[PDB]
Design an enzyme around this catalytic site. Structure first.
Site, PDB file in Angstrom:
ATOM      1  N   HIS B  19     -37.329  47.296   9.748  1.00 27.24           N
ATOM      2  CA  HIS B  19     -36.255  46.494   9.158  1.00 27.24           C
ATOM      3  C   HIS B  19     -35.866  47.044   7.794  1.00 27.24           C
ATOM      4  O   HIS B  19     -34.675  47.143   7.469  1.00 27.24           O
ATOM      5  CB  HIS B  19     -36.665  45.025   8.992  1.00 27.24           C
ATOM      6  N   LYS B  43     -39.836  30.303  18.983  1.00 27.36           N
ATOM      7  CA  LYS B  43     -40.689  31.483  18.945  1.00 27.36           C
ATOM      8  C   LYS B  43     -42.023  31.225  18.245  1.00 27.36           C
ATOM      9  O   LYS B  43     -42.840  32.149  18.148  1.00 27.36           O
ATOM     10  CB  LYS B  43     -39.956  32.654  18.272  1.00 27.36           C
ATOM     11  N   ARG B  92     -32.516  50.966  18.679  1.00 27.46           N
ATOM     12  CA  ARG B  92     -33.613  51.911  18.790  1.00 27.46           C
ATOM     13  C   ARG B  92     -33.712  52.336  20.244  1.00 27.46           C
ATOM     14  O   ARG B  92     -33.196  51.658  21.137  1.00 27.46           O
ATOM     15  CB  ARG B  92     -34.940  51.293  18.342  1.00 27.46           C
TER      16      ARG B  92
HETATM   17  C1  COD Z   1     -32.177  35.539  15.265  1.00 26.51           C
HETATM   18  C2  COD Z   1     -31.487  36.131  16.535  1.00 26.51           C
HETATM   19  C3  COD Z   1     -30.327  37.005  16.052  1.00 26.51           C
HETATM   20  C4  COD Z   1     -32.499  37.001  17.339  1.00 26.51           C
HETATM   21  O1  COD Z   1     -32.967  38.158  16.640  1.00 26.51           O
HETATM   22  P1  COD Z   1     -34.464  38.798  17.040  1.00 26.51           P
HETATM   23  O2  COD Z   1     -35.119  37.864  18.028  1.00 26.51           O
HETATM   24  O3  COD Z   1     -34.278  40.132  17.733  1.00 26.51           O
HETATM   25  O4  COD Z   1     -35.467  38.938  15.691  1.00 26.51           O
HETATM   26  P2  COD Z   1     -36.247  40.317  15.134  1.00 26.51           P
HETATM   27  O5  COD Z   1     -36.929  40.072  13.807  1.00 26.51           O
HETATM   28  O6  COD Z   1     -37.269  40.811  16.145  1.00 26.51           O
HETATM   29  O7  COD Z   1     -35.127  41.516  14.863  1.00 26.51           O
HETATM   30  C5  COD Z   1     -33.866  41.211  14.285  1.00 26.51           C
HETATM   31  C6  COD Z   1     -33.077  42.479  14.097  1.00 26.51           C
HETATM   32  O8  COD Z   1     -34.034  43.670  13.587  1.00 26.51           O
HETATM   33  C7  COD Z   1     -33.744  44.680  14.340  1.00 26.51           C
HETATM   34  N1  COD Z   1     -34.819  45.677  14.298  1.00 26.51           N
HETATM   35  C8  COD Z   1     -35.700  44.892  14.948  1.00 26.51           C
HETATM   36  N2  COD Z   1     -36.847  45.582  15.055  1.00 26.51           N
HETATM   37  C9  COD Z   1     -36.661  46.779  14.466  1.00 26.51           C
HETATM   38  C10 COD Z   1     -37.463  47.885  14.269  1.00 26.51           C
HETATM   39  N3  COD Z   1     -38.767  48.469  14.480  1.00 26.51           N
HETATM   40  N4  COD Z   1     -37.005  48.954  13.645  1.00 26.51           N
HETATM   41  C11 COD Z   1     -35.734  48.990  13.182  1.00 26.51           C
HETATM   42  N5  COD Z   1     -34.940  47.915  13.363  1.00 26.51           N
HETATM   43  C12 COD Z   1     -35.413  46.828  14.002  1.00 26.51           C
HETATM   44  C13 COD Z   1     -33.446  44.017  15.734  1.00 26.51           C
HETATM   45  O9  COD Z   1     -32.796  44.854  16.588  1.00 26.51           O
HETATM   46  C14 COD Z   1     -32.533  42.917  15.257  1.00 26.51           C
HETATM   47  O10 COD Z   1     -31.181  43.486  14.997  1.00 26.51           O
HETATM   48  C15 COD Z   1     -30.941  35.045  17.530  1.00 26.51           C
HETATM   49  O11 COD Z   1     -31.963  34.346  18.143  1.00 26.51           O
HETATM   50  C16 COD Z   1     -30.044  34.024  16.822  1.00 26.51           C
HETATM   51  O12 COD Z   1     -28.869  34.110  16.913  1.00 26.51           O
HETATM   52  N6  COD Z   1     -30.691  32.935  16.046  1.00 26.51           N
HETATM   53  C17 COD Z   1     -29.913  31.951  15.296  1.00 26.51           C
HETATM   54  C18 COD Z   1     -29.674  30.666  16.088  1.00 26.51           C
HETATM   55  C19 COD Z   1     -28.696  31.043  17.227  1.00 26.51           C
HETATM   56  O13 COD Z   1     -27.579  31.333  16.953  1.00 26.51           O
HETATM   57  N7  COD Z   1     -29.210  31.019  18.628  1.00 26.51           N
HETATM   58  C20 COD Z   1     -28.338  31.354  19.766  1.00 26.51           C
HETATM   59  C21 COD Z   1     -28.400  32.861  20.021  1.00 26.51           C
HETATM   60  S1  COD Z   1     -26.718  33.446  19.665  1.00 26.51           S
END
Ligand code: COD
Ligand code: COD
Ligand code: CA
Ligand code: CL
Ligand code: CL
Ligand code: CL
Lengths: 165, 159
Positions: B19, B43, B92
């Site tokens: 990140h 989660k 990724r």
């Molecule tokens: C929070 C949301 C976007 C989900 O994101 P996610 O589950 O992937 O969380 P996470 O921390 O794992 O990663 C977030 C972002 O980091 C990016 N990234 C993640 N891991 C890595 C990694 N090793 N390396 C580089 N970049 C990364 C991901 O691709 C993503 O863009 C989603 O659930 C959401 O919209 N939540 C708000 C409430 C909502 O609107 N819910 C309905 C879904 S639209």
């Protein structure tokens, strides 16, 4: 180093565009609204044996985008990593689709980052309505006399019609 | 010209060097980057929202234009409150592509004027998993190669 004024990005969208499709066009529209300058970079790609000449592919791309105020179309025969620097561009733009070749996009990105480490690789997604269009399948449908007006701008459709008869 | 505002949403449980690498690249590209830390109650996050926000701030505090805000609401509504026009997502080689397309496409229906944009992190960090960091930490493994020192300290304190 940093500054606090507006960051003027110059985004380069490379491809063969043989021909440019509604998929490319949708992506270019979105890029045009998001970024300061957008450069359509039409690669010679002589080993792909393109249906249309380079100048005609450029001309079709210009005609499709002439209504946008911040879009420029340029052909190039050199290495992309060098051309991007000639163009003073700091971002590579690529189309990301459900049917994209993900393995290939990352080799391309990783390798250009080795050759041009200060140029970012960035993906936009096109409209669902156009995301499945393939330049290759457009050529194949057109050569067999199919209606391609639903896939390409009218000028590209006419260029394809003249091309096969 | 005007100052565009870019929103980087996620759970950040915890924020990792993956990140962090993405945030650094976004920081150089855009005027304002907003790290949007989602509550994500289904989660069952290891860290509270406040703790996830604080670590993300501590890790990005040195950057000129990055702000961290927690949120419990719909992402599609939050982005308008924050006056942002771009969703920034990390892409990724091991990304969950099916999910990224459902997400981007459904949010395009809910917030049509917000583009979903994908950046790629450095190869060295692209394989880091927040989940695997938590599991390694719970078992007393060395996570200094995966997370910022402030995050490593917080994971050890938690376990
Ligand atoms: C929070 C949301 C976007 C989900 O994101 P996610 O589950 O992937 O969380 P996470 O921390 O794992 O990663 C977030 C972002 O980091 C990016 N990234 C993640 N891991 C890595 C990694 N090793 N390396 C580089 N970049 C990364 C991901 O691709 C993503 O863009 C989603 O659930 C959401 O919209 N939540 C708000 C409430 C909502 O609107 N819910 C309905 C879904 S639209
Ligand atoms: C031109 C390059 C990038 C290959 O790109 P490609 O052949 O895939 O071009 P193509 O016309 O098929 O599409 C170009 C872009 O549009 C995107 N997009 C493509 N199809 C669609 C579609 N239906 N809908 C929406 N978007 C699309 C693609 O994903 C791509 O981002 C590469 O060969 C190159 O860099 N050539 C220059 C010489 C060079 O430097 N070679 C070494 C490369 S490291
Ligand atoms: Ca300053
Ligand atoms: Cl193709
Ligand atoms: Cl909207
Ligand atoms: Cl994860």
């Amino acid at each position: 180093a940093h500054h606090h004024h507006h960051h003027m990005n110059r985004v380069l969208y490379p491809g063969t565009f043989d021909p440019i499709t509604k998929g490319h066009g949708d992506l270019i529209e979105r890029a045009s609204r998001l970024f300061d300058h957008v450069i359509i970079a039409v690669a010679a790609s002589p080993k792909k044996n393109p249906l249309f000449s380079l100048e005609q592919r450029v001309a079709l791309a210009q005609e499709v985008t002439k209504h946008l105020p911040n879009v420029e179309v340029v052909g190039f025969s050199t290495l992309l990593a060098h051309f991007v620097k000639e163009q003073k561009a700091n971002v590579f733009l690529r189309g990301l689709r459900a049917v994209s070749d993900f393995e290939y996009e990352f080799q391309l990105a990783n390798m250009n980052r080795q050759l041009a480490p200060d140029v970012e690789s960035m993906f936009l997604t096109p409209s669902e309505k156009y995301s499945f269009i393939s330049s290759t399948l457009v050529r194949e449908i057109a050569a067999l006399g199919g209606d391609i007006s639903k896939f390409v701008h009218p000028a590209v459709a006419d260029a394809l019609a003249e091309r096969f008869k």
